[PDB]
Amino acid sequence: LPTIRKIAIIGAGPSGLVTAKALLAEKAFDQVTLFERRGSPGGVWNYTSTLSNKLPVPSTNPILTTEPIVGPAALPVYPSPLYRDLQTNTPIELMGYCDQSFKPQTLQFPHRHTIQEYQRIYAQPLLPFIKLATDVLDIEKKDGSWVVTYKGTKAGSPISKDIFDAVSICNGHYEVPYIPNIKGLDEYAKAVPGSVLHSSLFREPELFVGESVLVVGGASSANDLVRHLTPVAKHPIYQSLLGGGDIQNESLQQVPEITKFDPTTREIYLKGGKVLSNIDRVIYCTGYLYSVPFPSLAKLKSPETKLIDDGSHVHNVYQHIFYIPDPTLAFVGLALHVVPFPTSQAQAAFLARVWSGRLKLPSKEEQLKWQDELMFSLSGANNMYHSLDYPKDATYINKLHDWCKQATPVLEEEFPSPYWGEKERSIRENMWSIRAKFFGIE
Amino acid sequence: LPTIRKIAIIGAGPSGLVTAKALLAEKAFDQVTLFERRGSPGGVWNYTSTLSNKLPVPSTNPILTTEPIVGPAALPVYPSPLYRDLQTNTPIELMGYCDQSFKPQTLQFPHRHTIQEYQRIYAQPLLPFIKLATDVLDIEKKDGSWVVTYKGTKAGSPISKDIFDAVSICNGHYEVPYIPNIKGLDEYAKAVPGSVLHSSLFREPELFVGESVLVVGGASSANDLVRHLTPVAKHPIYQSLLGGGDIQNESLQQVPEITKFDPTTREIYLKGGKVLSNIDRVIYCTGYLYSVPFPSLAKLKSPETKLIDDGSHVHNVYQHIFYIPDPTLAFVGLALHVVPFPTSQAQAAFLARVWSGRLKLPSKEEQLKWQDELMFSLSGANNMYHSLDYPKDATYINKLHDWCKQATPVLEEEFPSPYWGEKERSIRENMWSIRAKFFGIE
Ligand SMILES: Cc1cc2nc3c(=O)[nH]c(=O)nc-3n(C[C@H](O)[C@H](O)[C@H](O)COP(=O)(O)OP(=O)(O)OC[C@H]3O[C@@H](n4cnc5c(N)ncnc54)[C@H](O)[C@@H]3O)c2cc1C
Ligand SMILES: Cc1cc2nc3c(=O)[nH]c(=O)nc-3n(C[C@H](O)[C@H](O)[C@H](O)COP(=O)(O)OP(=O)(O)OC[C@H]3O[C@@H](n4cnc5c(N)ncnc54)[C@H](O)[C@@H]3O)c2cc1C
Ligand SMILES: NC(=O)C1=CN([C@@H]2O[C@H](COP(=O)(O)OP(=O)(O)OC[C@H]3O[C@@H](n4cnc5c(N)ncnc54)[C@H](OP(=O)(O)O)[C@@H]3O)[C@@H](O)[C@H]2O)C=CC1
Ligand SMILES: NC(=O)C1=CN([C@@H]2O[C@H](COP(=O)(O)OP(=O)(O)OC[C@H]3O[C@@H](n4cnc5c(N)ncnc54)[C@H](OP(=O)(O)O)[C@@H]3O)[C@@H](O)[C@H]2O)C=CC1
C-alpha cells in the first residue's frame, strides 16, 4: 500500500534494532513497533546459562517451534547459542554499526561481554518502541494490510492482533538446529541422553574433561569447539569433515563424513570404511536452518510465492530483502558469511528509503531476473543463496550505500549507510588471518 | 605450622582471586590452589538466566546445601543472584582493585557486563592455579595440617582429599537466602508456587507487568527492586519496612513489617493491624546468611572455637580474617557495607604478609580482646559484626595498608595495599548521593 505509515518489526536483535533506527530516521512513519519474545533486546547477545530443553535429533524441519524454558518464578527464557568464553570472529574495525564505535582499548576480537554491552547501549533509546516478552504467532496479508498475531510471553497472556502497512522480519537464522538424518543417529541419541549435542548447547568446556569427543563440521563452530576442547577433552579430538581433512596429529584427527551410528556397538561409521568407537560426545557443529514459523507464510508453497522449503535459505527475496510478490514484507539479516551489524544496517538504510517512497525498486520482472541469475550461479547449492563471502559483501554494501545516496529529498539528518573503502576491504579479505594472528593460531 | 608452603583457597570469586595474587606475590609459597564449583572464576559476576531450583521458604538455616542445576548436556550451574539490568551501586573511582583500573569511558556505575569483563581479565592469569568445577566438601585440621575434601563437580567425579598448611575461605556470603519464619508463610508459599520470591531469584522485571507486588526489606535489594518494578508492576508497589516508612504516594506505599500470612484468605497482616490482600508477588529482599558448609567446621559449637551459629556473622575471626584458635584458617570477604574488591584486597595483602612470616599477629589474648571490644559495641546486634560502614571501612583499609608497609624484608615487587586519601574518603562518604545523582533519583 505504497504510502506506508505503520511498520511492524519482528525481532529486537541487532537486525531488528538497526532496522528500527533507520525507519524512524525517515521521519515518515507514524508507528514503528518491534516485537521480541525475549525479556530484552540484543538477540543472541543475551548469554544464557540455560540450555534448550529439547534438542531435536536429527533436525531437518525448518518450521520447528522454539520452546522456551518456563517456571513459576521467572519470565520465559529463550536460550542463546553463545558459549561462555566466546570472543568475536569479526574485528572491531568492521563489526559495529558505522555510527557507534567501540570504547577505546577494546580488544580487536572482544569477549561477548563487550558486544552484549554494545547492543545494550544501542537498544536503550528504542525500548519504548519495543513490545518485550511478546511472541509473534503469525503474519498474513488480509484485506489491504498485514495482520500480525502475537501473544504476550507470560502464562495467561491473551492472543492479540494488529495491522500494519509493512512487516520487517528480523527473526534471525541461528535458532533451529541442523542435524542431518543419519541412519541410527536418533536411536544412538535417545539411548544415552547427552551423548549427542549440537553446538547451540555448548556453554562450558569443563564438562568434557577426560571425554573422547567427535566434532562434526568444518566451519567456525567446529573449528572453535575443537580449539576450546583441546586443553580439556581426551586426546585426540575427532573431527568429521565432508570430504575428510588433512590434519592427523596427536590432539586432532580429521576424518571423513558419517554414514551411520551403530546403536548396539555404539560405533560410528565414516565414509571410507573408517570406524569410531567409545565416543563419549558427538557434537554437531553443522549449523542451522532458516525459519519462517508463521502459518500464513509457511503454507505458501508455489515457486512464485514461497518463502521457505528445506530451510537452506529464504526464497523470493529481491536483494535478500524484499518479498518479490509483495514488497511490503521484507527481511533483514539473512546474509551469510558477512559481518552482521554493518550488513544489516546497509539493508536497513536501503529498506527505509524504499518504504518511505524516497527510493523506487526496479520492476517486478527485473527483480525476478535478479533472482533467476542468482539461482543459476548457485548451481543447485541453495544453501549458498544468501552467502556474500568477500568480495560479495563489500560490493553489496557499497552498492546499497550508493543507491541510498540517490534518495530524495535530502533530509536534515540522513541515517548513515556504511561504506567499505580500500582500508576496510583489506581487513575483510584477510579477516581470518588477522583473527588467527590475534588468537595466536593456525 | 608457621612455615606455610601449601595454601588452599576456597572460592574463585573476587575475594579468592585477589587472595591468590597477594599470596603468589610473596614468592614464599610452593603451592597456591583455588577451588571453584563453578565452571569459571568471578563469583557472582557470572550472570545466570538460570534460577535456583528450590528456594527454601522460610530460610534461617545457614548450613543449607546449595543445589546446582544439572543436566546431561551441561556442566552443573550454580545460579548467581545478579539480575539482568543490574548496574553497580559502587562508583568506578573506588570499586576496582588498586592495580587494575577500568577502561576509559566506563560509566561511573557501570552495567554488570563491565564488571564481569573486569573480573574475567583479572582472573585470566590465575586459571592454571584454579581447580574449576570442583566443590569443596569439607575442611578439617587433622594431624599437623588441613585436609580439604573435594569432589569434581561432574556426575561421576570421585571424592578426593589434599592437605595444606593454610586454608583461606572466600566462599562468599550472598548465597544462602534469609527469609524470616513468619507464621503462615510456608503454607502461603506452597499453595501458590511463584507467589513468594527472594531477591536472589529476580532476573527480568517484565514478569511482573500488571502484577501487584510486595517488596519486603529496606536496603539496596529492596530499593532497587522497587525502582525496577515501578514502570511495570501494578501501582502501587508495597514495601514492608521494619518500623514502617514515610513514603505513601501513588506508585509506592511503604508499610510496617509482617506479622503473618493468612493462607485461606491469602491476606498479609502487617504490624499495626494493617492488612494486605490480592498480592500477586511477595519478594523477600531480606538479605542472606553467612555460611560455612563444611562439616568439621560447622560442628564446632563452643564459644572459643565456633565459626557459625545463626548465620548473622562468622565468629572468632581476628580483624574479620584470622580464626583466633588457629590462624592457619582465614577468611577474606566477610565485610559488610563496604566496597568489596578494595576491601578484600586490603585483607589479602595483610593475610599474605602474615602467612609468609613477614608480619606477626598480636598475641592470642590481645586478639580475643579485639573481639570482646567488638561484641560489646554491637550491643547484641550480631548481624552488624562484620559491618564497616564508612568511616569504619576507610579506617580499616588504611590500617591494613599501614601495617603491610611494616612487612620485612622489602621485596622487589610489593603486592599493593589500597589506601583511601581525602579524595577517596569523600566519595565513599557521599557514595549513595553520588549514585542517586547518577541514576537521577531520590
Ligand atoms: C555461536 C554464535 C557466535 C556468533 N559470533 C559472532 C561474532 O563474533 N560477530 C558477529 O558479528 N556475529 C556473530 N554471530 C552472529 C549473530 O547472528 C549476529 O551478531 C547478530 O545476532 C545478528 O542478529 P539478528 O537480529 O539478525 O538475529 P538474532 O540475534 O538471532 O535476533 C533475533 C531476535 O528476534 C527474536 N524473535 C525471533 N522470532 C520471534 C518471534 N516469532 N516473536 C518474537 N521475537 C522473535 C529472537 O528471540 C531474537 O531476540 C554469532 C552467532 C552465533 C550463533
Ligand atoms: C545482587 C547483588 C549485587 C551486587 N552488586 C555489587 C556492586 O555493584 N558492587 C560491588 O562492589 N559488589 C556488589 N555485590 C557484591 C559482591 O558480593 C562482590 O562484588 C563480589 O562478588 C565479592 O565476592 P567473593 O569472592 O567474596 O564472593 P562470591 O562472588 O560470592 O564468590 C564466591 C565463590 O566461591 C565459590 N564457592 C563457595 N563455596 C564453595 C565450595 N564449597 N566449593 C567450591 N566453590 C565454592 C562460589 O561458587 C563462588 O564462585 C553484589 C552482590 C549481589 C548479591
Ligand atoms: N568465535 C565466534 O564468535 C563464533 C561464531 N560463530 C558464528 O555462528 C554462525 C553459525 O556458525 P556454524 O554453526 O559453524 O555454521 P556453518 O553453517 O558455517 O557451519 C556448518 C558447517 O558444518 C559443515 N557440515 C554440515 N554437515 C556436515 C556433515 N555431515 N559432516 C561434516 N561437516 C558438515 C558444513 O559443510 P559445508 O561447508 O560443506 O556445507 C559447514 O562447514 C556463523 O555466523 C559463525 O560465524 C560460530 C562459532 C563461533
Ligand atoms: N544495584 C546493585 O548493584 C545492587 C547491589 N546489591 C548488593 O547486594 C548485597 C546484598 O543486598 P541486600 O539483599 O539488600 O542485603 P541487606 O542484608 O542489606 O538487606 C536486608 C535488609 O532487609 C531488611 N529486613 C530484614 N528483615 C526484614 C523484614 N522482616 N521486614 C522488612 N525489612 C526486613 C533489613 O533491615 P535492617 O536494616 O533493619 O536489618 C535490611 O535493610 C549488598 O552488598 C548490596 O549492596 C543488592 C541489590 C542491588
Side-chain angles (χ1 to χ4, degrees), chain A residues 17 21 63 66 87 91 96 102 154 170 174 181 189 196 202 221-222 263 279 290 299 349 435:
Chain A
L17 296 173
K21 299 205 173 182
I63 211 183
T66 302
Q87 287 189 54
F102 288 95
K154 110 185 305 200
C170 307
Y174 291 135
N181 181 303
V196 176
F202 176 61
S221 274
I279 295 296
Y290 282 80
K299 71 190 184 185
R435 170 172 178 283

Side-chain angles (χ1 to χ4, degrees), chain B residues 83 86-87 89 174 216-221 224 240 242 285-288:
Chain B
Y83 40 90
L86 185 151
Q87 287 188 55
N89 64 186
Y174 291 135
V216 164
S220 68
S221 273
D224 247 302
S240 164
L242 276 148
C285 299
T286 48
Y288 306 70

Side-chain angles (χ1 to χ4, degrees), chain A residues 28-84:
Chain A
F29 312 109
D30 302 326
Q31 176 188 347
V32 175
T33 300
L34 290 87
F35 290 81
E36 171 62 61
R37 48 174 55 152
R38 283 190 168 95
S40 59
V44 301
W45 302 90
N46 275 103
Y47 181 72
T48 60
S49 53
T50 306
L51 291 210
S52 297
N53 174 39
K54 194 73 172 185
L55 167 73
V57 182
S59 180
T60 42
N61 190 313
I63 211 183
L64 192 68
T65 296
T66 302
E67 299 294 77
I69 288 56
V70 291
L75 183 76
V77 167
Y78 288 88
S80 165
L82 299 188
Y83 39 90
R84 192 191 73 206

